[PDB]
């Protein structure tokens, strides 16, 4: 399931069923041909997998820092 709003993603991370999250970086090119870093967040629940995509590195860093202490983040 794809999550469009960051609020929805954070709410899911608070669930006791979710204990781990994975982060993946992908290289992309914009219309002007300039490269940028795309960050993908994945959290697995007992019944479904949730994915969030962030195109800004600064925002992605803030998101990682805002995650609950109970949730462990691993990079692929």
């Amino acid at each position: 399931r794809e999550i469009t709003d960051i609020k929805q993603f954070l709410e899911l991370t608070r669930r006791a069923d979710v204990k781990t999250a994975t982060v993946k970086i992908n290289k992309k090119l914009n219309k002007a041909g300039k490269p940028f870093r795309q960050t993908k967040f994945k959290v697995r629940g007992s019944s479904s997998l949730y994915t969030l995509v962030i195109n800004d590195a600064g925002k992605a860093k803030k998101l990682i820092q805002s995650l609950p202490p109970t949730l462990k983040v691993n990079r692929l």
Partner: peptide
């Protein structure tokens, strides 16, 4: 043109964080 999005993003993060708790 992402300044407006950044402002809203920060507000969401601040609301989610609740490390400071008042005791009385």
């Amino acid at each position: 043109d992402d300044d407006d999005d950044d402002e809203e993003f920060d507000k969401i993060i601040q609301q989610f964080k609740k490390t400071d708790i008042l005791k009385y």
